[PDB]
Amino acid sequence: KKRFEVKKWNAVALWAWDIVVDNCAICRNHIMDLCIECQANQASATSEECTVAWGVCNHAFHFHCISRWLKT
Amino acid sequence: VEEQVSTTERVFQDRQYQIDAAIVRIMKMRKTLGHNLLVSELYNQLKFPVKPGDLKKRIESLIDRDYMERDKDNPNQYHYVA
Amino acid sequence: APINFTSRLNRRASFPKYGGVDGGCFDRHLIFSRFRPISVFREANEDESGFTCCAFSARERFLMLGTCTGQLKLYNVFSGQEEASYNCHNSAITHLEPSRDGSLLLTSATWSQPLSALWGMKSVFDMKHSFTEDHYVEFSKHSQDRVIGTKGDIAHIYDIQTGNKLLTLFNPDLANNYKRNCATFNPTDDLVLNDGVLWDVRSAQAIHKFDKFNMNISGVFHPNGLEVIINTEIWDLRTFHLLHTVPALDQCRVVFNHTGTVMYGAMLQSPFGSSFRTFNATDYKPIATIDVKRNIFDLCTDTKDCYLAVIENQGSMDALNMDTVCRLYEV
Amino acid sequence: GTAIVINPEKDKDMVQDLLDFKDKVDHVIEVCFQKNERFVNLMKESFETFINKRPNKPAELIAKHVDSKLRAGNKEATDEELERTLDKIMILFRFIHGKDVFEAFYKKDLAKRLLVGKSASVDAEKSMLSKLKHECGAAFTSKLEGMFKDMELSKDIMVHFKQHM
């Protein structure tokens, strides 16, 4: 009784391990919080410049608290 | 076109990451190493070589974050920080 | 409200579900107080056994047992026949646990590196990941793609798709330094109990720290999502209030069954006790002590609460003069 | 060779023109210079030297040229042609730096092929991933291969969801 009717629908969604992963493997602290070294003028006074990165296993982490181990 | 712009930005941002991760991943095996050698090591370490403009900027930030330091009383001479 | 089976059972005619009062809160004390041995598992081609741990497989087709030598052995759950044998570690296996899907097995050793590892069960017993810092390994309770390892008093949580470490939870000052700390998830996978400390999985800060009642057992979560035991102390995991204490849980490796109605475990200090106990999950009220008269290395129940698989030392509990076999008792 | 790579005005054909020039040179050496190593080894070095003249422009062109052939809409409709063109096009990918350009653009059109409409060929799509791993490292296609895997996983999932529905 309508001019148009849908018969098929293929919905798409992006999948992430929230997994209470608003946290970190090396750091503990929540990813939207400051990465320890940004809670004080340690790595930087610019606490607002502390960013968040994603990996390849459905989760995120602080940019700084993980990349700091590259020298190690 | 908008999609080409977004993919172009992704390339830029990925290059910007590599030049931040690099340098830190350099020096450790070459404790004393200058700017002209760092760009050369970066040519080989990076997927895409970095211009001296971006390189100097990343170096200064990497010094503030204790990954590298200057030596030999020379703006272009660097040493690994442990 | 009769105590006796005959009266309680006849009442079912007008008072369904069970008849009388209490029901399972009473009847569990008639069944989990009467254990009798049915069968035993031993290593093929060996004279004496060296099992240290066990678990039933995901589909309960076989019992999985770990040896003192770091091997995994799979036995037919019905016949007692060894079907397969794999190497996992170079020393005694402290823990074995399958996923619900049965794709992979979590194993860990008391010493040999990697202390924990992810081994495949489907098709090929290969490795997915080696964890050299994790003494104890365990699956989460709701979402099993996430697995928790224990490094001393530090919790390490990884996703088994690669074994990549996701989050850690620790604090040396809050830590009670338990001898057998085995970090574990709550039923809702948003709290971790690590060395007596309850961790907020959504902030990685401690939410609460429990007193060091014991030195060996850091505690286990109840499936009701309310109670957590720290050796003997029963705490409210929602408010962190103390609710009850049961001394019968002291040195008892108490875990729960599928339905969350039965809790059971072996006694600890070859640091093993010579008996095991069963408890009423309703309130941890002890049901019975089973007089095995053999040092017990480990134990597990099945989904159907039919037989409890207990690893008992029939030898002298020596390093070499030992005979640890897995003897199954019917409830 | 420089005349082709140095002029973006013909970008759309730059990959094919550089590949054609490379073959013309190699043909000359094979047939009349008797495959003398002096010219064989230098040919490659000369081409690497000028092919990587722009800020990795060829990588974008490679991603678009292989993706265009691989698109079901107005497809070649044969595997011989899809393989022939993806191979020749992808070969130039090994003469340049900044391979991120390919991945950044490729993954956008790859995502389209894996979600909406069809690819010209599944085997051709997999062939590209194999060609990319070589001379880049397996890590290069880790995300790109994972994208494919997700849809194979989705196929089983959507079946089970209907069963539950």
UniProtKB/Swiss-Prot annotation, chain A:
Instruction: List the RING-type ZnF regions, as residue ranges.
Output: 35-72
List residues binding Zn(2+) 1. Answer: C24, C27, H62, C65
Keyword Endoplasmic reticulum carried by entry: no
Q: What is its EC number?
A: 2.3.2.27, 2.3.2.32
Biological process, per Gene Ontology: cellular response to amino acid stimulus; cellular response to chemical stress; cellular response to oxidative stress; cellular response to UV; DNA damage response; MAPK cascade; negative regulation of canonical Wnt signaling pathway; negative regulation of insulin receptor signaling pathway
Metabolic or biological pathway, per its Swiss-Prot or TrEMBL entry: Protein modification; protein ubiquitination; Protein modification; protein neddylation
Keywords of this entry: Acetylation, Cytoplasm, DNA damage, DNA repair, Host-virus interaction, Metal-binding, Nucleus, Phosphoprotein, Transferase, Ubl conjugation pathway, Zinc, Zinc-finger
Cite the binding residues for Zn(2+) 2: C35, C38, C50, H64
- So which domain of life are we looking at? Eukaryota
Its cellular-component GO annotations read: Cul2-RING ubiquitin ligase complex; Cul3-RING ubiquitin ligase complex; Cul4-RING E3 ubiquitin ligase complex; Cul4A-RING E3 ubiquitin ligase complex; Cul4B-RING E3 ubiquitin ligase complex; Cul5-RING ubiquitin ligase complex; Cul7-RING ubiquitin ligase complex; cullin-RING ubiquitin ligase complex
Domain notes, please? The RING-type zinc finger domain is essential for ubiquitin ligase activity. It coordinates an additional third zinc ion.
Entry function = E3 ubiquitin ligase component of multiple cullin-RING-based E3 ubiquitin-protein ligase (CRLs) complexes which mediate the ubiquitination and subsequent proteasomal degradation of target proteins, including proteins involved in cell cycle progression, signal transduction, transcription and transcription-coupled nucleotide excision repair. CRLs complexes and ARIH1 collaborate in tandem to mediate ubiquitination of target proteins, ARIH1 mediating addition of the first ubiquitin on CRLs targets.
Q: Which family does it belong to?
A: Belongs to the RING-box family.
According to UniProt, the name of this protein is E3 ubiquitin-protein ligase RBX1
Swiss-Prot record, chain C:
Q: Which UniProt keywords apply?
A: Acetylation, ATP-binding, Chromatin regulator, Cytoplasm, Cytoskeleton, Host-virus interaction, Kinase, Nucleotide-binding, Nucleus, Phosphoprotein, Repeat, Serine/threonine-protein kinase, Transcription, Transcription regulation, Transferase, Ubl conjugation pathway, WD repeat
Q: Quote the cellular component terms of the Gene Ontology held in the record.
A: centrosome; Cul4-RING E3 ubiquitin ligase complex; cytoplasm; fibrillar center; nucleoplasm; nucleus
Q: In which tissues is it expressed?
A: Ubiquitously expressed.
Localization annotation:
Cytoplasm; Nucleus; Cytoplasm, Cytoskeleton, Microtubule organizing center, Centrosome
Keyword Plastid on entry:
no
As one GO molecular function, the record gives: ubiquitin-like ligase-substrate adaptor activity
Motif DWD box 1, residue numbers: 197-204
Q: What is the induction note for this entry? A: Up-regulated in a number of cancer cell lines (at protein level).
Where does each WD repeat begin and end? 46-85, 88-129, 131-168, 170-202, 203-245
The record lists the effect of R202A as:
Loss of interaction with DDB1, no effect on interaction with TET3
Which residue numbers does the motif DWD box 2 cover?
A: 233-240
An annotated GO BP: B cell differentiation
- Key word Transcription present: yes
Grouped into one coarse class, the protein's main location is cytoplasm
Origin: domain of life: Eukaryota
The Phosphoserine modification is found at S270
UniProt-annotated stretches for the region WD repeat-like region: 46-245
Q: What family, per the record?
A: Belongs to the VPRBP/DCAF1 family.
Q: What is known of its domains?
A: The protein kinase-like region mediates the threonine-protein kinase activity.
Q: How does it assemble?
A: Component of the DCX (DDB1-CUL4-X-box) E3 ubiquitin-protein ligase complex, named CUL4A-RBX1-DDB1-DCAF1/VPRBP complex. Interacts with DDB1; the interaction is direct. Also forms a ternary complex with DDA1 and DDB1. Interacts with NF2 (via FERM domain). Component of the EDVP complex, a E3 ligase complex containing DYRK2, EDD/UBR5, DDB1 and DCAF1. Interacts with DYRK2; the interaction is direct. Interacts with RAG1; the interaction is direct. Interacts with LLGL1 and LLGL2. Interacts with histone H3.
Put simply, this protein is called: DDB1- and CUL4-associated factor 1
The organism of origin for this protein: Homo sapiens
Q: Which gene encodes it?
A: DCAF1
UniProtKB/Swiss-Prot annotation, chain D:
PTM summary: Neddylated; required for activity of cullin-RING-based E3 ubiquitin-protein ligase complexes. Deneddylated via its interaction with the COP9 signalosome (CSN) complex.
Which family is this protein grouped under?
Answer: Belongs to the cullin family.
Instruction: Quote the function comment for this protein.
Output: Core component of multiple cullin-RING-based E3 ubiquitin-protein ligase complexes which mediate the ubiquitination of target proteins. As a scaffold protein may contribute to catalysis through positioning of the substrate and the ubiquitin-conjugating enzyme. The E3 ubiquitin-protein ligase activity of the complex is dependent on the neddylation of the cullin subunit and is inhibited by the association of the deneddylated cullin subunit with TIP120A/CAND1. The functional specificity of the E3 ubiquitin-protein ligase complex depends on the variable substrate recognition component.
Quaternary state and interactors? Can self-associate. Component of multiple DCX (DDB1-CUL4-X-box) E3 ubiquitin-protein ligase complexes that seem to consist of DDB1, CUL4A or CUL4B, RBX1 and a variable substrate recognition component which seems to belong to a protein family described as DCAF (Ddb1- and Cul4-associated factor) or CDW (CUL4-DDB1-associated WD40-repeat) proteins.
* The protein, known as: Cullin-4A
Where does this protein come from, organism-wise?
Homo sapiens (Human)
